[PDB]
Design a protein around this ligand. Structure first.
Ligand code: CL
Ligand code: CL
Ligand code: CL
Ligand code: K
Ligand code: MG
Ligand code: MG
Ligand code: MG
Ligand code: MG
Ligand code: MG
Ligand code: MG
Ligand code: MG
Ligand code: MG
Ligand code: MG
Ligand code: MG
Ligand code: MG
Ligand code: MG
Ligand code: MG
Ligand code: MG
Ligand code: MG
Ligand code: MG
Ligand code: MG
Ligand code: MG
Ligand code: NA
Ligand code: NA
Ligand code: NA
Ligand code: NA
Ligand code: NA
Ligand code: NA
Ligand code: NA
Ligand code: NA
Ligand code: NA
Ligand code: NA
Ligand code: NA
Ligand code: SR
Ligand code: SR
Ligand code: SR
Ligand code: SR
Ligand code: SR
Ligand code: SR
Ligand code: SR
Ligand code: SR
Ligand code: SR
Ligand code: SR
Lengths: 237, 119, 194, 46
RNA sequence: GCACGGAGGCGAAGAACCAUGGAUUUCCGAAUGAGAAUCUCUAACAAUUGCUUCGCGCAAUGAGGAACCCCGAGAACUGAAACAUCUCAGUAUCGGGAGGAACAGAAAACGCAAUGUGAUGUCGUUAGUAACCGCGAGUGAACGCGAUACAGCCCAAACC
RNA sequence: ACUCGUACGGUCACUGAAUCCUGCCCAGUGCAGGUAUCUGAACACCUCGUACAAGAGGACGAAGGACCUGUCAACGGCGGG
RNA sequence: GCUUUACUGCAGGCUGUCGCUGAGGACUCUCACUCCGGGAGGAGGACACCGAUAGCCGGGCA
């Protein structure tokens, strides 16, 4: 047949790329020499096109003006700290080691100095549970217990924008505007609604997948559609 | 470095080069890894020098063990061009061999002795 | 008596043993950090280079080249093919890696001509060969009795036409009798069946 | 459109070529500009 | 000039015309100072190399050519009365490269087994033979012989 | 490429606003997990065979399958007497 | 052209094995190699990636 939509994606053509030339900044933690002698002042709160959440512009002591992944409760004028000796206050960044157990953090680094990888979406937060000399245990938004190098930096507090998901889009037009700010092809035509040549589920008088939807992990691209390697399906049992 | 198994003090290297220079003026000396190699093989060698900045190292890797199974004493020089200058060459030399000193036999003896002590 | 050269030679018969083993372990670390073609002041296997024609003279150049290891990097058929012409994974190319290396070297030095080449090892993902190239325009070479032949017009781009030692062997021209019915005088003149 | 200096030189050449075979060439050869072009009926290059 | 006009001119200061050599030879073009649909903008081997006086100082490469030639990439229609091995075929076509011709070439050969031949192409033959093959359709040499033309040498190392 | 993105994410599918609801079936097929025992290739190893080699057999055994379990808003099914 | 538990194959995925690949039927280490870091250094580690081959799946494709 013809390559399915999931295969057109990988080519990274315009239709599938994110509007990067419109994105603001890479909200990675600042790189400090050591000591924590780095402080800045929240100079402004801005909208972040790539995450539908707010971001804060900070002016650091040494003269660096950088956008920051802002937690909830940060406002203009407030002073933020980034370093091993930073104060344990919402909005400050420091290694997990320096963080008191039982404190919600966000923008947690995967590997020390990478800039942050976990808990960066609207209103989410990781939960630092255990400390140690070799391993800091964090509970991520998905609820999974993650073991991290205690040298991994994080920001105290939860991410700004919480509850963004509580309000329904109501209209296709609203979904539309948001989708235009992402790297996604939208709207979505059902596989069952296409011709056999276009999808494993296409074809047949009435619409229906002429096959079970749970597909093997080993399936090749073009065939791996439907419920990928499902451990189970439905709501029952 | 892979063929070097002990460092020689700048002082010792100094005396050795000087001894080598008076060896060419008086006695006989071989210039070149090949000639140096045949001397150690024909047994007509008293003291053989081997630069340490030789690249590729294969050119001289064999001198150490070859010299051992032949009693011939050998010493390292930090630089290839000095050995060549001392050997009286307008170029460098990866290795050198004093094919019978000349009014330096005394010195050569001591250097060999000093080296053995240096392991 | 044995030449000093015989020692370099003998060392390279078992590149995985002795001092040579340790040298290679060290060297490759640096080679992996170098480009595809790095000119070098002196051959790594002196005995081999001199044996192949190398001379410490103006106009003689040596370069190390690395190539990815393995079979052909072939693209699967987009149009109809009978089972026989659908293979993609086990198909290998007809030129050996040493030859691919000689050609890349010669492309880097457009004015020089390949004289010969030899292997200097490999690791799990690539192979290295050193290539001897000659400057046919330098008088030190135009006046050499052992190398001036490579200055003739018909020797231009010799490597790209299989005129190299590695080229001739890969073309099946080693044997003078049995087995060379379709290789000599050329693969092409024999319909490409050798 | 906007023509460059070169385009203009080429257009001018085309205009010049687009002329009659001089009357004297007729006599001399004892009896047609096969390249006569019309701005409307024809289309030049570029 | 083709080109059978009109006007005018050149030629014995030997024109026209022909041969050989030289002069001039705009712009784009490998196109090379940067750029551009043949033009523009502010001294240029751009780019990759060799030598190096380490300075583009001296040099090389690049692109073209009817086919021929060498090295790589490599179909399908078709035949098998279907078709998959096989065939069409190493063909078409593609990438790279040289020359006036290319390639090959002075035996780790041959094996009419010999007390024999003696670098290599090519032509005739050996022969649709040996060999291959759903042992189907088909594919298909070599040694030798008769010719053409003939030509043998140079390194690495030993010892210096 | 997704991605200046990080589970309040984004990928793969099905249904198709709201409202009231969404029963029974895991035997077959699909996916997934487990698995004492069974089966399960090559290299290495062992036996026979070959002055060697071809080869024959053996021991070991991964995923996979047998077998067990989970799963239908998974393919689908909900008859005759 | 399309389909599939049609025939025969091919990609691709999983899995074992050999090379990369080192030292002291379960183990430690660091030195290749990988990743993080501007850097020092940290994490990992003879595994993984990659080359080769073997078994299973394999209308995704011919
Ligand atoms: Cl959304
Ligand atoms: Cl060449
Ligand atoms: Cl004969
Ligand atoms: K066919
Ligand atoms: Mg960021
Ligand atoms: Mg869009
Ligand atoms: Mg839809
Ligand atoms: Mg339809
Ligand atoms: Mg389909
Ligand atoms: Mg439906
Ligand atoms: Mg000579
Ligand atoms: Mg007019
Ligand atoms: Mg120009
Ligand atoms: Mg047929
Ligand atoms: Mg020919
Ligand atoms: Mg038949
Ligand atoms: Mg044939
Ligand atoms: Mg024969
Ligand atoms: Mg519907
Ligand atoms: Mg509908
Ligand atoms: Mg990296
Ligand atoms: Mg089909
Ligand atoms: Na070249
Ligand atoms: Na027109
Ligand atoms: Na001219
Ligand atoms: Na030039
Ligand atoms: Na220059
Ligand atoms: Na037919
Ligand atoms: Na047919
Ligand atoms: Na056949
Ligand atoms: Na005869
Ligand atoms: Na069932
Ligand atoms: Na059709
Ligand atoms: Sr980042
Ligand atoms: Sr970064
Ligand atoms: Sr369907
Ligand atoms: Sr249920
Ligand atoms: Sr030198
Ligand atoms: Sr050329
Ligand atoms: Sr018109
Ligand atoms: Sr002859
Ligand atoms: Sr509804
Ligand atoms: Sr089931």
């Amino acid at each position: 047949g013809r390559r399915i939509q999931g295969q057109r994606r990988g080519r990274g053509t315009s239709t599938f790329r994110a509007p990067s030339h419109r994105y603001k900044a890479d909200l990675e933690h600042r790189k400090v020499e050591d000591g924590d002698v780095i402080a800045g002042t929240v100079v402004d709160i801005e909208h972040d096109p790539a995450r539908s959440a707010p971001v804060a512009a900070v002016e650091f002591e040494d003269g660096d003006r950088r956008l920051i992944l802002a937690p909830e409760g940060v406002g203009v004028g407030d002073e933020l700290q980034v370093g091993v000796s930073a104060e344990i206050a919402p909005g400050n960044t420091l290694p997990l080691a320096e963080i008191p157990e039982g404190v919600p953090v966000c923008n947690v680094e995967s590997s020390p100095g990478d800039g942050g990888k976990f808990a960066r979406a609207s209103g989410v937060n990781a939960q630092l549970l255990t400390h140690d000399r070799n391993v800091a245990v964090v509970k991520l938004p998905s609820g999974e217990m993650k073991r991290l190098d205690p040298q991994c930096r994080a920001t105290i507090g939860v991410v700004a924008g919480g509850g963004r998901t509580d309000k329904p889009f109501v209209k296709a037009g609203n979904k539309h505007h948001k989708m235009k700010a992402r790297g996604t092809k939208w709207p979505n035509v059902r596989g069952v609604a296409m011709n056999a040549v276009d999808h494993p589920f296409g074809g047949g008088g009435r619409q229906h997948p002429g096959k079970p939807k749970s597909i093997s992990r080993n399936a090749p691209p073009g065939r791996k559609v439907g419920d990928i390697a499902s451990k189970r399906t439905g709501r029952g049992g | 470095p892979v063929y070097v198994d002990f460092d020689v003090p700048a002082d010792l290297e100094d005396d050795a080069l000087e001894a080598l220079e008076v060896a060419r003026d008086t006695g006989a000396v071989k210039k070149g890894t090949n000639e140096t190699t045949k001397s150690i093989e024909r047994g007509s060698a008293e003291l053989v020098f081997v630069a340490e900045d030789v690249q590729p190292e294969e050119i001289v890797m064999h001198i150490p063990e070859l010299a051992d199974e032949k009693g011939v004493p050998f010493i390292f020089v930090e630089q290839q061009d000095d050995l060549g200058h001392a050997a009286g060459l307008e170029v460098g030399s990866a290795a050198a061999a004093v094919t019978d000193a000349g009014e330096a036999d005394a010195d050569v003896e001591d250097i060999a002795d000093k080296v053995e002590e240096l392991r | 008596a044995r030449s000093a050269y015989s020692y370099i030679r003998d060392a390279w018969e078992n590149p995985g043993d002795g001092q040579l083993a340790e040298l290679q372990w060290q060297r490759q670390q640096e080679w992996r950090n170098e480009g595809a073609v790095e000119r070098i002041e002196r051959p790594t296997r002196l005995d081999k280079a001199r044996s192949q024609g190398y001379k410490a003279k103006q106009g003689v150049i040596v370069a190390r080249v690395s190539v990815r290891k393995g079979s052909a990097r072939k693209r699967r058929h987009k149009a109809g093919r009978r089972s026989k012409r659908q293979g993609v994974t086990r198909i290998t190319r007809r030129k050996d890696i040493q030859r691919v290396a000689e050609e890349r070297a010669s492309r880097t030095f457009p004015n020089l001509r390949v004289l010969n080449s030899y292997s200097v090892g490999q690791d799990g993902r690539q192979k290295w060969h050193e290539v001897i190239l000659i400057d046919p325009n330098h008088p030190a070479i135009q006046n050499d009795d052992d190398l001036s032949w490579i200055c003739a017009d018909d020797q231009a781009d010799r490597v790209f036409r299989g005129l190299t030692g590695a080229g001739r062997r890969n073309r099946g021209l080693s044997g003078k009798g049995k087995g060379s019915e379709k290789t000599r005088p050329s693969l092409r003149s024999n319909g490409g069946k050798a | 459109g906007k023509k460059s200096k070169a385009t203009k030189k080429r257009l001018a050449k085309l205009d010049n070529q687009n002329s009659r075979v001089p009357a004297w060439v007729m006599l001399k050869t004892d009896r047609r500009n096969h390249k006569r072009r019309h701005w409307r009926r024809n289309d030049t290059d570029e």
